[PDB]
Design a binder for this molecule. Structure first.
Ligand SMILES: Cc1cnc2c(NC(=O)c3cn4cc([C@]56CO[C@](C)(C5)C6)nc4nc3OC(C)C)cnn2c1
Length: 295
């Protein structure tokens, strides 16, 4: 028998509670909160509950069959994986014109957006950042403990709930768990070199998480075409080659950071970013180092 499943929404009900998928920003009165390579995310309100509705689409010139596959994968993964640091799927729509996925609304959006204080939100404190780093590592640990590879760890896919708890999202490319694939996927600025060459391994998640930790420490996005260096991961080299120090790069929009715990987190990041996959820590070691950082 099929057992537990997710609620099915009417496409028309989702259309209805997102104001017909209004792509205007929330401040303008619309419903668009964000977008990615595979969909646009709309704020909705169903059953006296604020929700996030992701309406899938080919925004990076993917095929329709591949998108349907990713839709199916995320439902499969979300059915098996429930944890305090993973987002929760409320339901889906597949009857109407487009595929939709419905999630618990995350009042503080994505880590990427909060690090960029997008829309005027106040900067995250060091204390909040440490909790976020710890929570995301607990979420990755749950995934890896349950033999899942995320393949797209990045600060846009770490969402922040009503308590600024980190919630990992977007499991459409997740893989069961070393093998080599012909379809290279992910976000270039976060990807381990072996992932960039087609290898599939949880060690690649660890590298990408190290980039996220650099974003947390510095407030800088992983890539910025108008910045020198354009890739954040290249600051590790400038620090190691003593052109710079980690203090030179610490986010200045923070009044409560202290050198010891920042250097402790940078140490974890540096260990995750070892470009030899076999030299990186596993997630359980990352978790432990991060717990000791605020001990
Ligand atoms: C796979 C997947 C994708 N996305 C999601 C989401 N998203 C959201 O709930 C979400 C919520 N907010 C709230 C705000 C703000 C704007 O001004 C403020 C004061 C309110 C912050 N901005 C958001 N942005 C959101 O999403 C975007 C990052 C795409 C939930 N689950 N989920 C699962």
């Amino acid at each position: 028998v099929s057992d537990t499943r997710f609620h099915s929404f009417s496409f028309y009900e989702l259309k209805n509670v997102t104001n017909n998928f209004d792509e205007r920003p929330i401040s303008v009165g619309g419903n668009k909160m964000g977008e990615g390579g595979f969909g646009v995310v709309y704020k909705g309100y169903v059953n006296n509950t604020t929700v996030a509705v992701k309406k899938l689409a080919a925004m990076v010139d993917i095929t329709t069959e591949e998108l349907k596959q990713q839709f199916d994968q995320e439902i499969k993964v979300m059915a098996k994986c429930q944890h305090e640091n993973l987002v929760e799927l409320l339901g889906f729509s597949s009857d109407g014109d487009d595929l939709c996925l419905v999630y618990v609304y995350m009042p503080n959006g994505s880590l990427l957006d909060r690090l960029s204080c997008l829309d005027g939100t106040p900067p995250l404190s060091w204390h909040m950042r440490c909790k976020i780093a710890q929570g995301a590592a607990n979420g990755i640990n749950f995934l890896h403990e349950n033999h899942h590879i995320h393949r797209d760890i990045k600060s846009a896919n770490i969402l922040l709930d009503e308590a600024f708890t980190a919630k990992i999202s977007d499991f459409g490319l997740a893989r069961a768990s070393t093998v080599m694939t012909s379809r290279i996927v992910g976000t270039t600025a976060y990807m381990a070199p072996e992932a960039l060459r087609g290898e599939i391994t949880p060690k690649s998640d660890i590298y990408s998480f190290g980039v996220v930790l650099l974003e947390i420490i510095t407030g800088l996005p992983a890539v910025d075409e108008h910045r020198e260096p354009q890739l954040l991961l290249d600051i590790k080299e400038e620090i190691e080659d003593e052109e710079k120090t980690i203090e030179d790069y610490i986010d200045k929009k923070m009044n409560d950071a202290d050198s010891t715990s920042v250097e402790a987190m940078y140490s974890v990041a540096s260990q995750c970013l070892h470009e030899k996959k076999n030299k990186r820590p596993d997630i359980k070691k990352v978790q432990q180092l991060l717990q000791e950082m605020t001990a």
